[PDB]
Amino acid sequence: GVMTGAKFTQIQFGMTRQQVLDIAGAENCETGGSFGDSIHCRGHAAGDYYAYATFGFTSAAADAKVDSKSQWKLLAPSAPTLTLAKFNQVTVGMTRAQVLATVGQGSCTTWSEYYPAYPSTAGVTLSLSCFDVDGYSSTGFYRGSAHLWFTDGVLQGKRQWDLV
Amino acid sequence: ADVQQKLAELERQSGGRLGVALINTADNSQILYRADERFAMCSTSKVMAAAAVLKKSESEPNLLNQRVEIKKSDLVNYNPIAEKHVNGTMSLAELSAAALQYSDNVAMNKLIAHVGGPASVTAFARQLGDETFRLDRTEPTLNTAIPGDPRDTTSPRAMAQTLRNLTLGKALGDSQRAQLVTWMKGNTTGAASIQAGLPASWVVGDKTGSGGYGTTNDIAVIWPKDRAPLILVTYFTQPQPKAESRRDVLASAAKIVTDGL
């Protein structure tokens, strides 16, 4: 099959390029072009492209390790409960734990997650996509969602579209 | 009339609203279906934003090499190329290619911002003689596609004439026209839309769009085997807010209007 959320979850930070391809299925994946030395794996048709993952590595070397995981429409929120009111309760400067308790522990999926000093977590950057009860779709247009981004575990900004 | 009846029955079976405009440049003939009604363009508007930047480059010929910063505050739901360059830069060439070949939403917003905002993209359309096109919003909200909402809409007739002028005519300088065609031909997405209704030997440069209400769009320049090129716009939208895409309807419309070529 194509790239999936289960495959994305099975792939871990620190795995090699070939470990990524073992799990993802190299028939789904590419490198080069617009993706540089990252590995980009397509899932099902969605929107004007495909659900996908992009994996970044510590270097171009054949045995470099995953230091970056990004995905679009591979993961559904486990219990979306975000509202406009909860979004307005989030404040720049909050820690990740404070944000998740505010928006709901099941409301978000990880959009991008990057460790520039991998295996160290210093400088980690994180983008969460968070959804109201029916805002997520694995194929079509979001119906109520937010982008929350962090550096070193501290919320640096927030944006939302169509929350109520 | 036979082609009209087939498009009407396709629309009826599909449950939605279909708009089609074909231009055959061999004889300047057209096949039109709801071609003066408005449809939400969704990502098909990325062609106009890219073309507006190309037009600007005619007065600033190093423009496509100029760098643009990408920040987390720029991200807008779908951006597979720009997210690789957060806290870095992309050139306007890279942003144009990402918008046209991956439908990257950050790339679209940088092209819009570069020319001065949505009203400036609309002004570019007016300068080409297109009085119908309107770009009102940025990504991602330009895709809401609410029935009755004229924001971010055009008509099939207007978009087919404008795409002709851009890709085959003189709306752009020669090198800019070649660059636009190169980008659209190099876009290998869209194989399930207009291209799926055409013979495999035909060369297609297209841009799809998708949005709310199951909106499913494609605009294309088409080089049939041994024939003058075609321009084809196919727009489709559905009554249900959460309707799923129907790329196959666009393929079906493309087959109907090119049959016999």
Among the partner-chain residues B73, B94, B208, the one whose CB lies closest to the CB of A48 is B208
- Cα–Cα distances (Å) from A109 to A128, A132, A152, B59, B88, in that order, read 6, 12, 18, 44, 24
Q: Do A157 and A94 share a structural domain?
A: yes
| Rg of chain A taking only CA atoms, in angstroms | 16
Which residue does chain B place closest to A151, by CA atoms? B72
Q: Do A60 and A92 share a structural domain?
A: no
Chain B contacts of A36, Cβ < 8 Å? 84
Q: Do A137 and A90 share a structural domain?
A: yes
In angstroms, what is the resolution? Answer: 1.6
Q: Do A153 and A90 share a structural domain?
A: yes
Domains of chain A: total: 2
Cα dihedral sign, A117-A118-A119-A120 = positive
Q: Do A95 and A148 share a structural domain?
A: yes
Which residues of B have a CB under 8 Å from any CB of A? 42-43, 72-73, 75-78, 80-81, 83-84, 86, 94, 97-98, 101-103, 140-141, 143-144, 189-190, 192, 208-212, 214, 241-245, 247
Cβ contact A40–B72 (<8 Å): no
SS3 sequence, chain A? CCCCHHHHHHCCCCCEHHHHHHHHCHHHEECCHHHCCCEEEEEEEECCEEEEEEEEECCCCCCCEEEEEEEECCCCCCCCCCCHHHHHHCCCCCEHHHHHHHHCCCCEEEEEEECCCCCCCCCCEEEEEEECCCCCCCCCCCCCEEEEEEECCEEEEEEEECCC
Chain A contacts of B77, Cβ < 8 Å? 129, 142, 145, 147, 161
Strand partners, B237: B17
| Rg of chain B taking only CA atoms, in angstroms | 17
Cβ contact B244–A125 (<8 Å): no
CATH code at position A107 = 3.30.1450.10
Give the count of alpha carbons within 13 A of B1, CB side only. 0
Which residue does chain B place closest to A112, by CA atoms? B83
Q: What's the CA gap between B122 and B125, in Å, rounded?
A: 5
Most B CBs within 10 Å, among A141, A143, A147, to test the B interface: A141
**Method of elucidation:** X-ray
Residues of A123-140 as b/e, b for ≥16 C-beta within 10 angstroms?
A: ebbbbbbbbbbebbbeeb
Chain B contacts of A125, Cβ < 8 Å? 72, 86
Q: Do A150 and A124 share a structural domain?
A: yes
Cβ contact A137–B242 (<8 Å): yes
| Owning domain of residue A94 | 84-161
Q: Is B43 a catalytic residue?
A: yes
Among the partner-chain residues A38, A49, A112, the one whose CB lies closest to the CB of B189 is A49
In a domain, A79, yes or no: no
Domain-terminating residue out of A72, A96, A121: A72
Q: What's the CA gap between B122 and B133, in Å, rounded?
A: 7
Which of A76, A102, A78 lies closest to A158, judged by CA? A102
Residue B230 in tokens: 């075609």
Q: CATH for B2-258?
A: 3.40.710.10
Q: What angle do CA A138, B137, B87 make, to 5 degrees?
A: 70
Query: B46 labelled as ligand-binding?
Result: yes
Distance from CA of B117 to the nearest CA of A (A): 19
Chain B contacts of A162, Cβ < 8 Å? 141
Q: Do A151 and A108 share a structural domain?
A: yes
CB contact at 8 A, B249 and B14: yes
In a domain, A78, yes or no: no
CB neighbours of residue B66 within 10 Å: 15
Q: Do A49 and A90 share a structural domain?
A: no
Cβ contact A54–B73 (<8 Å): no
Cβ contact A48–B72 (<8 Å): no
Domain-terminating residue out of A72, A93, A109: A72
Distance from CA of B236 to the nearest CA of A (A): 14
Chain A contacts of B80, Cβ < 8 Å? 40, 49, 52, 54, 70, 72
Domain-terminating residue out of A72, A100, A125: A72
In a domain, A130, yes or no: yes
- Cα–Cα distances (Å) from B140 to A7, A8, B21, B150, in that order, read 28, 25, 26, 16
